[PDB]
Amino acid sequence: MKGILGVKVGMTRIFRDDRAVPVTVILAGPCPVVQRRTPEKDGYTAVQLGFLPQNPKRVNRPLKGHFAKAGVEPVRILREIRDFNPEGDTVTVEIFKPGERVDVTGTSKGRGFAGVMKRWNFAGGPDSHGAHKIHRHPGSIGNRKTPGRVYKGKKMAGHYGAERVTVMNLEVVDVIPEENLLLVKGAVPGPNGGLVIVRETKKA
């Protein structure tokens, strides 16, 4: 199980064998291992990875000390990859070849307080034919005296987005080791400049 931290930079399409293929460009590495989670010590198997150089004037002493035990330059983002033990002390885009498929995790764009039509694709009300002040309302939310309450998990309006989202089985289109670029076919959660995690796919 391999993986790398990265930032979503933007979208384009490229051409491949006379086909347009939309891609999301991801600036992937390079990620240094800063901690290795071992069974005997930690209970499981993973690698704490760093990403993006940080101004040491912003990094406190407990964090500074952590970085030092790995002999690693202060990084902005500290993140783990499960069941991953690369041989290097540094992880680069080269852990992926084109053609391979990957799962990508990001933080979805935040709709803030979303109504029930936008959140759960509800239908809302008529916009005429008598409809009274309920054009975007959720309608009924229950039965009557039996059960006399509202289900846990009832789809209602409220905050939506800004959450962890993992689109799955995305094709690696190309990789550019010289610039740490990853080209993934299709969409990737979250905004440009947003942090993302790219892992070996779990789909066969």
Partner: protein, 118 residues
């Protein structure tokens, strides 16, 4: 939402908000320093800086441009003759906002000052 939207609404419709910036600009250029609520102040920075930069061009075009917002021919003269020269060697940032330490009694609004920079 509001994702990457730029520019306030200031609870005015389009033509009112436009009139607002103009009447604020005219005052700033008139007295060199005015006091307003902090948000209007921050929004005035850019509106006027453009007009000042245009007086720094001096060309008839720019004059007729600035005239659209400022409307007063004598004020535009002062802009071109007395004001714009001061900033010949300054690249943007002709205005500053400093926040006052007290609030309006009648509605507790935080105030700031907007002045033409030296």
């Amino acid at each position: 939402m509001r994702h990457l939207k730029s520019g306030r609404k200031l609870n005015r419709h389009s033509s009112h908000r436009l009139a607002l910036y103009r009447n604020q600009a005219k005052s700033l250029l008139t007295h060199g320093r005015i006091t307003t609520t902090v948000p209007k102040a921050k929004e005035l920075r850019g509106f006027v800086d453009h007009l000042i930069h245009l007086a720094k061009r001096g060309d008839l075009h720019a004059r007729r441009l600035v005239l659209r917002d400022l409307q007063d021919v004598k004020l535009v003269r002062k802009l071109f003759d007395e004001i714009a020269p001061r900033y010949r060697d300054r690249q943007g940032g002709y205005t500053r906002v400093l926040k006052l330490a007290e609030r309006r009694r009648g509605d507790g609004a935080p105030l700031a000052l907007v002045e033409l920079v030296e």
